[PDB]
Each structure stands twice: as structure tokens, then as C-alpha cells.
Amino acid sequence: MLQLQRQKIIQDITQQIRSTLNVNHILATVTQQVKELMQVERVIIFRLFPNGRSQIVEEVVSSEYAALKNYHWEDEKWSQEILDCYWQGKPRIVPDVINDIWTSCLVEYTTQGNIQSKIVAPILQELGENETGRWVSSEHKQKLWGVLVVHACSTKRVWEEDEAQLLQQIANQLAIAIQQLEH
Amino acid sequence: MLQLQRQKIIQDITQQIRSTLNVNHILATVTQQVKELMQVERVIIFRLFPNGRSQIVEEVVSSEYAALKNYHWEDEKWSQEILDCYWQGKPRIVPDVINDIWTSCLVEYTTQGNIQSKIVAPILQELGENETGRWVSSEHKQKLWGVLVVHACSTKRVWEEDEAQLLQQIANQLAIAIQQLEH
Ligand SMILES: *[C@@H](C)[C@H]1/C(=C/c2[nH]c(/C=C3N=C(/C=C4\NC(=O)C(CC)=C4C)C(C)=C\3CCC(=O)O)c(CCC(=O)O)c2C)NC(=O)[C@@H]1C
Ligand SMILES: *[C@@H](C)[C@H]1/C(=C/c2[nH]c(/C=C3N=C(/C=C4\NC(=O)C(CC)=C4C)C(C)=C\3CCC(=O)O)c(CCC(=O)O)c2C)NC(=O)[C@@H]1C
């Protein structure tokens, strides 16, 4: 019968639930919006795992340039001066990545991605209680879940304060949303 | 300048985040869909708190009938036979609420809501570890968060198995979504 039409919305409703409630769908939607809004050739999310691994988990490329999605690496150590900056929730403006000494090794990765300049915006979990790893601070009582990056590949783009100021405000809203959807 | 247009999407993006991530917005949207789909005059969510309190937290009424939103009560005890049924994740079809012995006291509430017949669908949290209250089971290792109800007020409506079968499938999808958004 038309008991058939009962389930053409249950598959809708279940769709909206699993949609809104899995993290990746709201990563892939935010990133797509940051990309279109800042007219940036690439937006990525760099996920930092405590064991030392780290992977590009979402990316939204201008089709001109490579897909660095899923790109990865183990035992990721960052420079202490850099991590102090990102722990305080401050972004980073890298107006020339190729002569940036902190990204002096991601030159394979730099040259493929075609990155000239970029803004790096930390994503911070207020994680209290007991957890410790490679990306966790005792001074600032927060863990660095990962990093929202924006890539300017076609030109050595100059960035404004309120462009980075803005980015960080968007990551800081992912910090909250991620603390929620981890099971 | 047009730095103005930077923030006419940050207020958008923040909107989608706080939207999708607060529980009530996805309660109020599901209930509105259950109402329109089953052509029921009222849909409510009965929230059961462990201390004994209990309140109608969402409701979507056919404007003809009262707003039982926010309706409430303390030290809510249910009949043991009834709770056993709901713990196993089984709905309940009350084809005549007025001579239902289990709802023999909600007759103030019955007479205002104009309820003739109704389907009650439990919402179950797989909550392990250590928590105990008035709505928690050791036999079934699950807590009764609350209850999705549908009200047939204009007529003593007859319900189908796949109407209740269906309801329960929708609550069971809220069970998962709620376990996620509790901070
Ligand atoms: C070299 C000085 C050290 C380092 C720098 C560093 N990396 C990032 C962020 C990223 N790290 C990677 C991945 C890699 N780490 C590697 O060591 C290698 C191999 C060469 C790879 C491929 C990636 C993809 C990123 C994100 C880069 C991006 O901009 O899209 C940072 C943080 C961001 C920044 O530029 O400030 C830094 C400082 N990481 C190390 O492990 C080296 C000791
Ligand atoms: C009376 C036998 C007992 C009882 C029955 C019972 N109530 C519900 C669900 C609801 N309980 C309320 C609220 C009230 N509980 C009260 O004791 C009073 C005062 C009279 C109120 C107002 C509400 C709003 C509900 C939801 C009702 C709905 O159908 O919309 C149930 C579960 C649902 C069912 O009908 O099977 C039951 C069994 N609860 C008690 O506390 C009494 C001992």
C-alpha cells in the first residue's frame, strides 16, 4: 500500500540526524564556506593525533591544484615558540611559506600544494581532567586538537589582521563543536 | 569599508553551528516533522529527570488545542509493568486514554489536552558505568531519558502496528542524538 510513503521520510529524518550529528559533515560544510568567502585556492584541516600522527582530514581545493586530502605523517613535532603562540589561541600569518623557517621541511608538501602564503588558525579543546600527549599544555589547560589552514597558491597574497582575526573566530567555533561530537 | 561583508557570514556560520549543535533545535525540528507526517493534532516530548521531576519540553500543537509545553510535575512514579515494557524499547498504543488505567491520574492533563488516543515511544540512553536514579534499569543496562508521544484529539483514532513501529524507530534515532549533545 502507501505504507510505502511512511518510510520516504524516515530515510529523510534519519538522514538529517546522521547528517547534522557526524563531525565530518560540519567540517566539510564550514571549510567549503571559508573557501568561498575568503576566495582562497585551498582550505584544509590539519588533525593532530596525540600518538604523533597527523593528517589532512578535510580539504576543499580550487580544482587547479592538488588534493592534499588524507596527507599524513607520524611523530609530528612542532617548534616550541610556535606552539606557545597557537596555545594562546592566536593565529599565524605566513606571508611567504617558502622562506618560513618553521615550515622549512614541508617543502615537498609546500611545492606540490603550490602554497605561497597562508594563514594558520589553531583549534583548541578545553580538555581538563586527565589526558596527556604531544599536543597538550599544562600552562594553558588546553589541548591542540589540530589546525584550520588557508592556502594562497596563485599569488603571494597579502593578508589583513581581520582576515586572520576572522579565521581564528571560525576555528574557535569549531573547537566547541568538536568537543561535543567525539562519542 | 566592505570589511562589513566579512561578518554577514560569520554570523551565518556561527548560526549554523549553534543551530545544529544545540539539542532543542533538533528536537523542535523532528517533532514538527512527526506531527506533519502522521497528521496528529499534537506531538510532545516528555523529559524524565532522575530527581523525580518531569516536563513537556517540546510540543507542536495543532492550534486548536492547548499548549502543554512546559507542563511539569515532581516525583513521577510509573507503574512497574509499564516501565518494563518501555525499557525493552517497545512502544505503547493507548487506543482509549480516558479508560487507560495507567494514565488514570493524568485526567486533568487528559481533559485539557483533549487526548482520546495516543502512541507513547520511549527514548533510551545506553548509559553504562555509574549513574542511578528513578528511571534506570539494571536488567536492561539502559536509562529512560524520556518519551516521545503523539496525541489524537479530534477523534478516537485507530493506530497501525507500523505507525507505532514507525514512531519507535524515530525515538530510537533521538536516543543516539541525545547521548551526544549533553556537554
Ligand atoms: C619542520 C620544521 C617541522 C614541522 C613544521 C610544521 N608543520 C606544520 C604543519 C604541518 N605538518 C604537516 C605535515 C608534515 N610534517 C612533516 O614533518 C612532514 C614531512 C615533510 C609533513 C608532510 C602538515 C601537512 C602541516 C600543515 C601544513 C599547512 O600549512 O598546510 C606546522 C604548523 C603550521 C605552520 O605552518 O605554522 C609546522 C610549524 N612539523 C614537523 O613535524 C617538523 C619538525
Ligand atoms: C498515574 C497512574 C501515574 C502516572 C502515569 C503515567 N504518566 C505518564 C506520563 C506522564 N506523566 C505526566 C505528568 C503527570 N504525572 C502526574 O502524576 C501528573 C499529575 C496528574 C501529571 C500532570 C505526563 C504529562 C505524562 C505524559 C502524558 C502523555 O501521554 O502525554 C505515563 C507514561 C505514558 C503513558 O500514558 O503510558 C504514565 C504511565 N505517572 C505518575 O507519576 C502517577 C503515579
Side-chain angles (χ1 to χ4, degrees):
Chain A
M1 206 60 86
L2 211 51
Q3 188 171 330
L4 156 83
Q5 188 61 226
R6 297 212 171 97
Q7 319 206 34
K8 273 168 202 161
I9 183 71
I10 202 271
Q11 183 249 317
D12 289 327
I13 296 181
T14 311
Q15 203 80 54
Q16 293 104 41
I17 293 198
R18 318 251 278 258
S19 218
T20 43
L21 183 53
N22 126 285
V23 217
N24 274 123
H25 166 266
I26 83 185
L27 279 192
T29 30
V30 166
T31 49
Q32 234 161 10
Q33 268 175 322
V34 175
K35 187 258 168 291
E36 197 180 9
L37 138 72
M38 300 188 39
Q39 301 146 19
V40 161
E41 282 92 24
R42 187 194 280 93
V43 175
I44 62 118
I45 310 248
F46 200 57
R47 170 60 165 293
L48 300 182
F49 312 100
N51 73 93
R53 195 184 148 87
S54 51
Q55 188 192 138
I56 300 199
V57 306
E58 267 301 325
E59 167 209 61
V60 172
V61 260
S62 188
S63 35
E64 253 298 294
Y65 303 96
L68 314 178
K69 301 189 64 156
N70 308 133
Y71 204 119
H72 58 168
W73 205 73
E74 260 103 3
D75 203 88
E76 188 99 21
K77 287 165 176 136
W78 285 352
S79 260
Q80 172 62 92
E81 304 88 322
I82 269 246
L83 286 157
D84 266 282
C85 167
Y86 293 125
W87 264 328
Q88 306 166 20
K90 277 183 170 298
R92 194 161 103 88
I93 298 180
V94 192
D96 185 31
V97 179
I98 342 156
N99 284 110
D100 178 56
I101 198 63
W102 321 94
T103 293
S104 97
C105 37
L106 335 176
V107 292
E108 40 162 86
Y109 169 89
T110 259
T111 304
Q112 165 75 328
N114 228 330
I115 308 144
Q116 303 212 61
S117 65
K118 70 171 168 170
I119 306 172
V120 186
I123 311 181
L124 286 173
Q125 294 309 330
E126 199 229 0
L127 158 112
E129 297 163 330
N130 177 26
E131 168 178 85
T132 320
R134 189 177 306 261
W135 310 105
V136 299
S137 184
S138 314
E139 294 183 4
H140 311 77
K141 274 206 184 176
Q142 257 159 339
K143 172 187 50 185
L144 183 58
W145 183 90
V147 139
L148 173 57
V149 189
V150 118
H151 285 126
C153 316
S154 59
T155 66
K156 216 179 295 302
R157 184 171 171 185
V158 289
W159 307 99
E160 298 175 77
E161 110 161 307
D162 310 280
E163 274 190 340
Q165 170 150 54
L166 187 260
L167 196 57
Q168 188 57 66
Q169 232 123 325
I170 298 184
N172 277 138
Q173 230 60 15
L174 286 204
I176 292 136
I178 272 154
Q179 190 160 334
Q180 277 272 73
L181 274 50
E182 296 282 60
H183 308 80
Chain B
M1 206 60 86
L2 211 51
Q3 188 171 330
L4 156 83
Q5 188 61 226
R6 297 212 171 97
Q7 319 206 34
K8 273 168 202 161
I9 183 71
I10 202 271
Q11 183 249 317
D12 289 327
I13 296 181
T14 311
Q15 203 80 54
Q16 293 104 41
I17 293 198
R18 318 251 278 258
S19 218
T20 43
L21 183 53
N22 126 285
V23 217
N24 274 123
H25 166 266
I26 83 185
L27 279 192
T29 30
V30 166
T31 49
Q32 234 161 10
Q33 268 175 322
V34 175
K35 187 258 168 291
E36 197 180 9
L37 138 72
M38 300 188 39
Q39 301 146 19
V40 161
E41 282 92 24
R42 187 194 280 93
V43 175
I44 62 118
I45 310 248
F46 200 57
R47 170 60 165 293
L48 300 182
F49 312 100
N51 73 93
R53 195 184 148 87
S54 51
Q55 188 192 138
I56 300 199
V57 306
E58 267 301 325
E59 167 209 61
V60 172
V61 260
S62 188
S63 35
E64 253 298 294
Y65 303 96
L68 314 178
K69 301 189 64 156
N70 308 133
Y71 204 119
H72 58 168
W73 205 73
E74 260 103 3
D75 203 88
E76 188 99 21
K77 287 165 176 136
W78 285 352
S79 260
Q80 172 62 92
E81 304 88 322
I82 269 246
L83 286 157
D84 266 282
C85 167
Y86 293 125
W87 264 328
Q88 306 166 20
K90 277 183 170 298
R92 194 161 103 88
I93 298 180
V94 192
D96 185 31
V97 179
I98 342 156
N99 284 110
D100 178 56
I101 198 63
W102 321 94
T103 293
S104 97
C105 37
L106 335 176
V107 292
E108 40 162 86
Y109 169 89
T110 259
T111 304
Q112 165 75 328
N114 228 330
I115 308 144
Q116 303 212 61
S117 65
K118 70 171 168 170
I119 306 172
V120 186
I123 311 181
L124 286 173
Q125 294 309 330
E126 199 229 0
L127 158 112
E129 297 163 330
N130 177 26
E131 168 178 85
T132 320
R134 189 177 306 261
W135 310 105
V136 299
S137 184
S138 314
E139 294 183 4
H140 311 77
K141 274 206 184 176
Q142 257 159 339
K143 172 187 50 185
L144 183 58
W145 183 90
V147 139
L148 173 57
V149 189
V150 118
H151 285 126
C153 316
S154 59
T155 66
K156 216 179 295 302
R157 184 171 171 185
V158 289
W159 307 99
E160 298 175 77
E161 110 161 307
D162 310 280
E163 274 190 340
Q165 170 150 54
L166 187 260
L167 196 57
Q168 188 57 66
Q169 232 123 325
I170 298 184
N172 277 138
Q173 230 60 15
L174 286 204
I176 292 136
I178 272 154
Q179 190 160 334
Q180 277 272 73
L181 274 50
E182 296 282 60
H183 308 80

